[PDB]
Amino acid sequence: SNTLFDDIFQVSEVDPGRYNKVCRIEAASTTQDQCKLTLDINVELFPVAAQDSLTVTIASSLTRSWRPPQAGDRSLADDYDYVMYGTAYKFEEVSKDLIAVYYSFGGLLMRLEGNYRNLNNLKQENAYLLIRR
Amino acid sequence: TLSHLRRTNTPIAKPRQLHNTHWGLVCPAETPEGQACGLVKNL
Amino acid sequence: ASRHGQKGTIGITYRREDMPFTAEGIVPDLIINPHAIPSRMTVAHLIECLLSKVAALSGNEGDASPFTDITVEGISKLLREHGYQSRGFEVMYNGHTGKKLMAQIFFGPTYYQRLRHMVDDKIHARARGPMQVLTRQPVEGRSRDGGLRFGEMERDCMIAHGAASFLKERLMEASDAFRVHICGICGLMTVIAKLN
Amino acid sequence: RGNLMGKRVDFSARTVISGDPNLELDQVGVPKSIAKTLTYPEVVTPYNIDRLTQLVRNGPNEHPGAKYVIRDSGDRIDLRYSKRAGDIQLQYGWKVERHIMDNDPVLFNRQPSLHKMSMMAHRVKVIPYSTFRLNLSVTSPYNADFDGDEMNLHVPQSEETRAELSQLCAVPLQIVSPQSNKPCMGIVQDTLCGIRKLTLRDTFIELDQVLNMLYWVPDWDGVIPTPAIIKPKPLWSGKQILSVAIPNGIHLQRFDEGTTLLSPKDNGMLIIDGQIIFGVVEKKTVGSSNGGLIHVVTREKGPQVCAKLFGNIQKVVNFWLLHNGFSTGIGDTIADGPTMREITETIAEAKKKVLDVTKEAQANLLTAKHGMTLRESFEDNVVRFLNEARDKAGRLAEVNLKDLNNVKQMVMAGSKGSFINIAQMSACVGQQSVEGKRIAFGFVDRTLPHFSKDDYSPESKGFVENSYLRGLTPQEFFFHAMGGREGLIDTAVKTAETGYIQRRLVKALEDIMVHYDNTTRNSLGNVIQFIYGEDGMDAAHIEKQSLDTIGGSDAAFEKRYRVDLLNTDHTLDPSLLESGSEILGDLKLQVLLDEEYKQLVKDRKFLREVFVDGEANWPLPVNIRRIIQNAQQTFHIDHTKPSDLTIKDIVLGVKDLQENLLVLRGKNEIIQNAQRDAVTLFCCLLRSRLATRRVLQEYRLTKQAFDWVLSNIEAQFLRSVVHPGEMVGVLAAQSIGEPATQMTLKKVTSGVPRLKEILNVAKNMKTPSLTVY
Amino acid sequence: MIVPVRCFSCGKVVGDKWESYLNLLQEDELDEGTALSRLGLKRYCCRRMILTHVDLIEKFLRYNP
Amino acid sequence: FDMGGYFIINGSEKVLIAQERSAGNIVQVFKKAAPSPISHVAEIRSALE
Amino acid sequence: MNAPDRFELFLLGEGESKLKIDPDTKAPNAVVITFEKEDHTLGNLIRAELLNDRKVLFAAYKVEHPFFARFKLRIQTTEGYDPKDALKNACNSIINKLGALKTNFETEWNLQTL
Amino acid sequence: FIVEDDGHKELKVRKGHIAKLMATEYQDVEEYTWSSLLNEGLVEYIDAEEEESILIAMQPEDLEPAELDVDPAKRIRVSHHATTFTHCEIHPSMILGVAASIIPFPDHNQSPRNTYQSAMGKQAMGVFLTNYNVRMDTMANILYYPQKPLGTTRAMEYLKFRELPAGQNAIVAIACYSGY
Amino acid sequence: SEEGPQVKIREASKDNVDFILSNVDLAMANSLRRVMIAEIPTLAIDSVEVETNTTVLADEFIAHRLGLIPLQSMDIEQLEYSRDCFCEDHCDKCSVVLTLQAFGESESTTNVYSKDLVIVSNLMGRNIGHPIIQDKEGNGVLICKLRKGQELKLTCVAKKGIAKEHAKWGPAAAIEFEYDPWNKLKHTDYWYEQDSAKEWPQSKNCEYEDPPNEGDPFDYKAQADTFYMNVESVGSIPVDQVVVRGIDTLQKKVASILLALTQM
Amino acid sequence: YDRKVPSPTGEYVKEPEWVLETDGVNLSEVMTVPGIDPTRIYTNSFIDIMEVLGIEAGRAALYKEVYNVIASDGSYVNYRHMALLVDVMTTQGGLTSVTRHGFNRSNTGALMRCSFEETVEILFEAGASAELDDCRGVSENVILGQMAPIGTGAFDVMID
RNA sequence: AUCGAGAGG
Numbered sequence A: 001s002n003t004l005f006d007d008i009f010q011v012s013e014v015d016p017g018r019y020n021k022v023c024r025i026e027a028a029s030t031t032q033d034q035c036k037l038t039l040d041i042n043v044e045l046f047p048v049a050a051q052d053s054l055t056v057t058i059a060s061s062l063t064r065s066w067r068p069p070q071a072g073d074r075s076l077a078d079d080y081d082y083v084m085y086g087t088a089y090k091f092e093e094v095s096k097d098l099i100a101v102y103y104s105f106g107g108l109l110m111r112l113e114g115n116y117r118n119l120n121n122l123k124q125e126n127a128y129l130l131i132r133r
Numbered sequence B: 001t002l003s004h005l006r007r008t009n010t011p012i013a014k015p016r017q018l019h020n021t022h023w024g025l026v027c028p029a030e031t032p033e034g035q036a037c038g039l040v041k042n043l
Numbered sequence C: 001a002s003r004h005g006q007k008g009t010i011g012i013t014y015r016r017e018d019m020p021f022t023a024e025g026i027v028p029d030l031i032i033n034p035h036a037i038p039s040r041m042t043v044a045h046l047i048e049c050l051l052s053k054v055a056a057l058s059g060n061e062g063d064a065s066p067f068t069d070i071t072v073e074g075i076s077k078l079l080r081e082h083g084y085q086s087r088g089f090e091v092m093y094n095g096h097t098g099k100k101l102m103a104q105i106f107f108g109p110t111y112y113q114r115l116r117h118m119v120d121d122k123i124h125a126r127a128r129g130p131m132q133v134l135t136r137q138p139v140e141g142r143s144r145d146g147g148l149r150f151g152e153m154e155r156d157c158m159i160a161h162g163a164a165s166f167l168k169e170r171l172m173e174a175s176d177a178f179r180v181h182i183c184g185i186c187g188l189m190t191v192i193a194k195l196n
Numbered sequence D: 001r002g003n004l005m006g007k008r009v010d011f012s013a014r015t016v017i018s019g020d021p022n023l024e025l026d027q028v029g030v031p032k033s034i035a036k037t038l039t040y041p042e043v044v045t046p047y048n049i050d051r052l053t054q055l056v057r058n059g060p061n062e063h064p065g066a067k068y069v070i071r072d073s074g075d076r077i078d079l080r081y082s083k084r085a086g087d088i089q090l091q092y093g094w095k096v097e098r099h100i101m102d103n104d105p106v107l108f109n110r111q112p113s114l115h116k117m118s119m120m121a122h123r124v125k126v127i128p129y130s131t132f133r134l135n136l137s138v139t140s141p142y143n144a145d146f147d148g149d150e151m152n153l154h155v156p157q158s159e160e161t162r163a164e165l166s167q168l169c170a171v172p173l174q175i176v177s178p179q180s181n182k183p184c185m186g187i188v189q190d191t192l193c194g195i196r197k198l199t200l201r202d203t204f205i206e207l208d209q210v211l212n213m214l215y216w217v218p219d220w221d222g223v224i225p226t227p228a229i230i231k232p233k234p235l236w237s238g239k240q241i242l243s244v245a246i247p248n249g250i251h252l253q254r255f256d257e258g259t260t261l262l263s264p265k266d267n268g269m270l271i272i273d274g275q276i277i278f279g280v281v282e283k284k285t286v287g288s289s290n291g292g293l294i295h296v297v298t299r300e301k302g303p304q305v306c307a308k309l310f311g312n313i314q315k316v317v318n319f320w321l322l323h324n325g326f327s328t329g330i331g332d333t334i335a336d337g338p339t340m341r342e343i344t345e346t347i348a349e350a351k352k353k354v355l356d357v358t359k360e361a362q363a364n365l366l367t368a369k370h371g372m373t374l375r376e377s378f379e380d381n382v383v384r385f386l387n388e389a390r391d392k393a394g395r396l397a398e399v400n401l402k403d404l405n406n407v408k409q410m411v412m413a414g415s416k417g418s419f420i421n422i423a424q425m426s427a428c429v430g431q432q433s434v435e436g437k438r439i440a441f442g443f444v445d446r447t448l449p450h451f452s453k454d455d456y457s458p459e460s461k462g463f464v465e466n467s468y469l470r471g472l473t474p475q476e477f478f479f480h481a482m483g484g485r486e487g488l489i490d491t492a493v494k495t496a497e498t499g500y501i502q503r504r505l506v507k508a509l510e511d512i513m514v515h516y517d518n519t520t521r522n523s524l525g526n527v528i529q530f531i532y533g534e535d536g537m538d539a540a541h542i543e544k545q546s547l548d549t550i551g552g553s554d555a556a557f558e559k560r561y562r563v564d565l566l567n568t569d570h571t572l573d574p575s576l577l578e579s580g581s582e583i584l585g586d587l588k589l590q591v592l593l594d595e596e597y598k599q600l601v602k603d604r605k606f607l608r609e610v611f612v613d614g615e616a617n618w619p620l621p622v623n624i625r626r627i628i629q630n631a632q633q634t635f636h637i638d639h640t641k642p643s644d645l646t647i648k649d650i651v652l653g654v655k656d657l658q659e660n661l662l663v664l665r666g667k668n669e670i671i672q673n674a675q676r677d678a679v680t681l682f683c684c685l686l687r688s689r690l691a692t693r694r695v696l697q698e699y700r701l702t703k704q705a706f707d708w709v710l711s712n713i714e715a716q717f718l719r720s721v722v723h724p725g726e727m728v729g730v731l732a733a734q735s736i737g738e739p740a741t742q743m744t745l746k747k748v749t750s751g752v753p754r755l756k757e758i759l760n761v762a763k764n765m766k767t768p769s770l771t772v773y
Numbered sequence E: 001m002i003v004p005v006r007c008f009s010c011g012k013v014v015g016d017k018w019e020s021y022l023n024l025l026q027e028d029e030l031d032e033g034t035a036l037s038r039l040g041l042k043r044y045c046c047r048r049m050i051l052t053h054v055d056l057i058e059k060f061l062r063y064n065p
Numbered sequence F: 001f002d003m004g005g006y007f008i009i010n011g012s013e014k015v016l017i018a019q020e021r022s023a024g025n026i027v028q029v030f031k032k033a034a035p036s037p038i039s040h041v042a043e044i045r046s047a048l049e
Numbered sequence G: 001m002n003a004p005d006r007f008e009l010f011l012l013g014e015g016e017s018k019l020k021i022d023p024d025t026k027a028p029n030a031v032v033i034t035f036e037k038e039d040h041t042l043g044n045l046i047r048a049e050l051l052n053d054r055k056v057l058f059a060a061y062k063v064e065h066p067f068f069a070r071f072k073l074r075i076q077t078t079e080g081y082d083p084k085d086a087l088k089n090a091c092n093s094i095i096n097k098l099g100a101l102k103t104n105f106e107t108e109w110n111l112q113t114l
Numbered sequence H: 001f002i003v004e005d006d007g008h009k010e011l012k013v014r015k016g017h018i019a020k021l022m023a024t025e026y027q028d029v030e031e032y033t034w035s036s037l038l039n040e041g042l043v044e045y046i047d048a049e050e051e052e053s054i055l056i057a058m059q060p061e062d063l064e065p066a067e068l069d070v071d072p073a074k075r076i077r078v079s080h081h082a083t084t085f086t087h088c089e090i091h092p093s094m095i096l097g098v099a100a101s102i103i104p105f106p107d108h109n110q111s112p113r114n115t116y117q118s119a120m121g122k123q124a125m126g127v128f129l130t131n132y133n134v135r136m137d138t139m140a141n142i143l144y145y146p147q148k149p150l151g152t153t154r155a156m157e158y159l160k161f162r163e164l165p166a167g168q169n170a171i172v173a174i175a176c177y178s179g180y
Numbered sequence I: 001s002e003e004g005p006q007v008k009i010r011e012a013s014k015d016n017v018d019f020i021l022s023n024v025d026l027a028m029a030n031s032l033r034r035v036m037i038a039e040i041p042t043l044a045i046d047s048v049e050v051e052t053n054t055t056v057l058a059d060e061f062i063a064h065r066l067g068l069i070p071l072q073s074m075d076i077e078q079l080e081y082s083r084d085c086f087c088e089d090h091c092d093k094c095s096v097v098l099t100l101q102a103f104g105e106s107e108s109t110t111n112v113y114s115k116d117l118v119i120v121s122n123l124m125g126r127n128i129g130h131p132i133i134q135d136k137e138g139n140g141v142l143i144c145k146l147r148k149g150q151e152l153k154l155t156c157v158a159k160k161g162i163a164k165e166h167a168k169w170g171p172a173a174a175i176e177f178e179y180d181p182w183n184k185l186k187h188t189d190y191w192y193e194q195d196s197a198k199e200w201p202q203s204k205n206c207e208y209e210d211p212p213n214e215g216d217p218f219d220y221k222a223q224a225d226t227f228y229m230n231v232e233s234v235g236s237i238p239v240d241q242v243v244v245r246g247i248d249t250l251q252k253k254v255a256s257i258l259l260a261l262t263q264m
Numbered sequence J: 001y002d003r004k005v006p007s008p009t010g011e012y013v014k015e016p017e018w019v020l021e022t023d024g025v026n027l028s029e030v031m032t033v034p035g036i037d038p039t040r041i042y043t044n045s046f047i048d049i050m051e052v053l054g055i056e057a058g059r060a061a062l063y064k065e066v067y068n069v070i071a072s073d074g075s076y077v078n079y080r081h082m083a084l085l086v087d088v089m090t091t092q093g094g095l096t097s098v099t100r101h102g103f104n105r106s107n108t109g110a111l112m113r114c115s116f117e118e119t120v121e122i123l124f125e126a127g128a129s130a131e132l133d134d135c136r137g138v139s140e141n142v143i144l145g146q147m148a149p150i151g152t153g154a155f156d157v158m159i160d
Numbered sequence K: 001a002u003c004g005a006g007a008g009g
């Protein structure tokens, strides 16, 4: 139930694909050339300016029927400002000594490429994405 | 009532098709459907 | 049906409170689908809605005469002067929810014609009923309490389905079933029969 | 013809029809008065005696009453008028004629009976209004649109008849069409447009909406999906709620245009375990087309689950649409001024080109063209100019239209409309066509009196530059009237001709039926086909599948399908198979691998002879892509782990499956050979998708998975075989008949006149021809 | 045939206004829409009933029996 | 408003359609099919007064 | 002809209960109530006030057919909380809110002069 | 109408004749009638064969001498580029029959739909005559509250449809509500 | 004033009242509208028996008009539903009986008006059944014009009713609804060719709410608490009373649900 | 015409090919003339193909052109239905037609034949011929009212 | 019953 992957990215570009609410985000790992990320995000819920650096985190947990947060006795998983849940569609090997990770948060799509980890982000449908300001 | 009062029958070599000569003399579009289209028109 | 060739039966009858309402409170008398319009390609229905709205707010008649140079932009300019949206679209709220509608709805006055076809004069059902003498078969037509014809094209549909017994039931037991006595040696119904 | 083959039938009903979204597709809404009039006989049973007594007490006037009661002596008892109606005492063996009630089998029909789909059984639901009520998705097999449509209902009078209607003629069974091998019924109209709009990523649902929409699903588990977006607010994806609608265990992959796994366009569909991973639902996704979600759900889950799926999707999408709303107005038709000026420029350029070509004809400078009159060439060039002009104006309009335009939304969803409609509304409608030609001079050397004599310019010729929105000139309106009139005469005449053709085909092929030997034979017993369809398989189960062997280079085929045990690189990598390190350099295994490779090479040559075009995609009995996907999801498949599969078992089990698959059970060698020929192409496909390298690398298969795949292929193929007693000929005739009515319209006889020539085996064709290579 | 009591969309009574409306047009020589605004019908639901109406009754009155 | 033009026979209003007929006393040349002994014909339908 | 009488919308029939309560299968602390001879008006309000209550996990209303005037409400609550009590508190809150609004409007109208 | 020479070639009918015709309408001064114009020679009757010899113009303004900036929405009207016009049509809309005359803006719509409506206007309910209550028809249907159409063809006044309407100007919304 | 919903009234007339509902859930506002027109009771004729008809108009048409005729319903609470009393066809408490007779005495046309209506049933000191006249002339709504030599004589029975059953028992014609005038909540997306602001009109209700600023983000959490409403009256019941009666009707339905739960 | 042919690599590649189209057909002199592939030549007319080559070739051409008619409208039909019709015309060896001088002239039961056309003529010839109906045909049983063998009537159902 | 006319998808 522990956190799997954490990294810092500076967004390379933001592109609205005929959508006012959602723009796709292109970014690369900071201080690592191993990995890069490409994920769509609703800008209205959380606006990301281009060239901003935003923390990225993935956790397995912290299905059971969703309940309203209500009192919040359950400890907030994230101090982060943005979180999404999704299921990985496929995992592929982009190149020798290189892995690729494909996630789908309700049709919204995330792509992570790197060899930085040899094993992580197993094909478990559970995923949580945490982005700080 | 008026349209029935102004009626044409063409009993029976392409009668059904509207013809250029009909301009100014016959309604372009008023015709019964079925096996009467163009055969019967209104002035 | 409207004068522009759009024809439609009443799917449902709805009370005013259920109907979507504009901010003014005006409720459409009738609802027509967007989908029917594109294939038929009758722009003049839309144009009539626009011009009739301008006329209703203007107190003057509208001329839809053919081959007359009337610009849609000008009619929309007059509608804008009235304050209603130029293209005829209007802000609407869903009736049951009371929520605003994400898509503004195009609604306005439109001439519509009641037609001679009436449902209750068309409704018919037979069950067991009177029979014609010679055919020994059900009479024809609602006016005579008649029975609907099972077409040979319909029997072909049934053969495609392969329901032989249902075909027999419609063909004999629902129709001129009859019992006859035949002599084997004649091979014909020459036998005279005193059943009791 | 009219009192024996077709006759008036008792227990008949007919009304005007209308559609109800909430009514389930298999059901038909029957007005209560019709139920009161119609009766079904029911022998009194100990099970039904209480219900029957109560029903007779209710009386004929109110349903579930009854009309007549029949004794053991059988003398009629009339409930409307009887002194003894109160004292009614049911005795065993007596019959009770009773009102038609909810969930009773009937037959529902539209008067054109082009297809067996037009006459099919329906569940009954009694309703208090004059119109028959039916689902929107059931319109297409009937071809019914509720402008003034009238439909007929018939009621069985015997238990065997009830069973025949329920077991073979029910709507769920006829979901997938025999002809065209694609489902008949699909999501249409408002549900289509709303399903596209909801599936858009921009569309985000809210907790109140998601709760109501989840409740709206009748079979809903109550399991609340986790919100796609949580921390800023809990917002569910529209895709997520629609996924709540999808039955679990269904997987669908469609790639269109640039359908990347990232799918930026959101084109194509990715569905896993009853949840759409990505894509926007559209017509191809949810329509009648082959490979549609209807087809897969009917084929794997079953017919009833898919029948409920229509209704669940319908309810969810209709509720969301009602709350979102939809419209269509004049502004959708209006295009921007700069685009309008570009349209006018296009028309002007076409006019200049036409004038210059006309001058070329006048000067006799224009080059002669072999095989045609020079005036004929002129006509072709001007017609093509005008047609291209209209298409280009439509292109500029389509670029001009914004994403918000509702006609665009109808086209994008595929619910209704086309490119031509948009062009005609906001661009040049174009040149009219009369009798396959541009407008002729009815007046001497002039099309119309107002034009000057001997004018061949497009306006006189009937080319209608103005848009429908722009308004048509009087001359243009008259020309358009000529074209429309020709269209109406054509519709009437072709309906008559198609009726005659369909009757003749039906009468010719009516007797044709598959007997128990699988030999297609007439009444006399003279064989028409020794194996029906030459494969002996039901056409509904056949779906388009690709044949991997026929396509691709020899090098690519070798790399994908060849593993050479006696090589450093060609041998299977040890990660693919744990015994691979042991298996390396074993001749006894390589001999079997070589045998399978020889079989695949022979199959490639055989298929390449059959297909000169080399098109891999063909109708095939059992889909194997979906079955491999079902294997991956049924048994969780890990890429990292080496497989536990003996190579020997893979090859030997493909062979074993080959002799297990059976079309004809006879022991005799003639029947065995007919079977081997019948199953030949299916065997080639099976070998193509069961290759040892393919089984080891592209899918990380296991022994239990492979055994299940073998058994499931066997079972699906067994289900795919035709059933004896089927009337193949009638179905064939109807299958040809229905598309013929739909047909509507440089010298080729085509369409219904051509079909009439083909059936008449007429000595003289209107346009004979020889194509020499 | 005769002035409708109420508009089917609007719902407001419209029968009372008609006599006054015809008088307003004839005596004041004024535009119909201005007369409708003076009458108080400001919504086209309420307005269509007054503008479109045909008083067939008067012709029906002419027949002696 | 009734424009008239309908006969009243046995209490029923009855109206007469006009029948289109090609005019008499007009001569026209008509081509003959390929399987015809004669290439062209010229036909005149003469109408009495 | 076949059309049912208008009074059927607001009048209960013979052997008809305004509320019928049946627990939802395959769900915890969940129950579905068939409100009979009632329309959207009441259902949406009941849903909103139910949503305001924190302990009520699920609330939704559905109309099976526009023909027939009835609506089905499903409620899921926290353990130890009966759905009927939640419905009672939400309805009581509705009544108090309507009363407060009528008093405030009456005072405002008394202030209003025309 | 008749077009002859006068130094611009101009239609025979002139404004003063129109004023006398209007005065005849007002008194309903010496009567000015259509029979007068036919006897005056201002207008002529033309059979189909006679048309084959003549040259006609749709619009009277076409005759005015030709010698830019225009609104895009106006339909593309070909510059007539023609002379020696024998006559000019009174109005194009006259080619339409009675049933087609009732259709509004058919110039902006597809012709087959206009044909269908011309078929439907017969079926449409209406007040058939003012004498209906006195008359004894086998079957008769009459609207409760007939309403004049908001959009009127200029031919409607001669058609008397405004006087005897057959439809209602109902408020119509184009939307998908509840899927019915 | 009290905790809970508040109403501020911008303007008010005897026929119309324009106010601002505040601090309210929207579902309550829509339930209130549907009660305000649908559910509130009102008195109108449900039976008509005509002795003489010489009018060209048929009796059924006149009966429909008489149903739509507006009558006072202020004391309607004292009156009882015709099905809810114990009478045969009409209790004197449950129904009000009206009579109308007119003859074409004048050679010129004689026009029936709503003022020419005769009440026979006992009034019982209840402000009920008086014909409603808003005309400046005071002449009632025109049922029918009658030429000389024509007479009509008829009896009407008016009963308590609800607007859902038939439109005649309806207090109000239409209501004006407005929320999110600036479209800050963005509940609806404008359809525009070039600019939404120019093509879509700006309402007067927009001014009351504070103007939006482009810089501030869209408030996801925000929900509508302020609504703008106007009410129109036929005059059968005064406006303040129609809105208060709608509130009371809704509260009655809620109390009925509570009592049914208690019965269970 | 664009032709997809195997490359030496084995890939199907498209290289244009000249083709000839004629307005008329004699087809016996044409195939013998040199410079043209006898194997690839095609005719729009079946009957000439049946005379020139053989009945099975004519059946294939029949299906080809029916398929062209279906494809021109965008409609698709499974090969079995069209093939079945073509075999029914083909099984006699002659190019039997879907018309009165077709299936009706065949040796099938007269009562089946009488339904289509020439009812009383089929009957008078059968009466002169003393022809006996097998009553196997579906139309025969439908007229007779006895249950035809249609799947359901094909099998007799006996108890154990 | 016959004959005929008009209409509907």
Ligand SMILES: Nc1ccn([C@@H]2O[C@H](COP(=O)(O)CP(=O)(O)OP(=O)(O)O)[C@@H](O)[C@H]2O)c(=O)n1
Residues within 6 Å of the ligand: B034, D112, D143, D145, D492, D495, K009
């Ligand atoms: N004589 C006739 C005339 C009509 N019909 C049937 O009525 C349907 C309605 O379409 P329709 O008549 O309007 C022709 P369509 O091409 O479908 O245009 P649309 O989109 O406006 O519906 C047709 O599809 C036919 O099946 C028939 O069976 N015999």
Ligand SMILES: [Mg+2]
Residues within 6 Å of the ligand: D144, D145, D146, D147, D148, D149, K009
């Ligand atoms: Mg239809």
Ligand SMILES: [Zn+2]
Residues within 6 Å of the ligand: C183, C184, C185, C186, C187, C188, C190
């Ligand atoms: Zn004998």
Ligand SMILES: [Zn+2]
Residues within 6 Å of the ligand: E007, E008, E009, E010, E011, E012, E043, E044, E045, E046, E047, E048, E049
């Ligand atoms: Zn109104």
Ligand SMILES: [Zn+2]
Residues within 6 Å of the ligand: I080, I081, I082, I085, I086, I087, I089, I090, I091, I092, I093, I094, I095
């Ligand atoms: Zn009483």
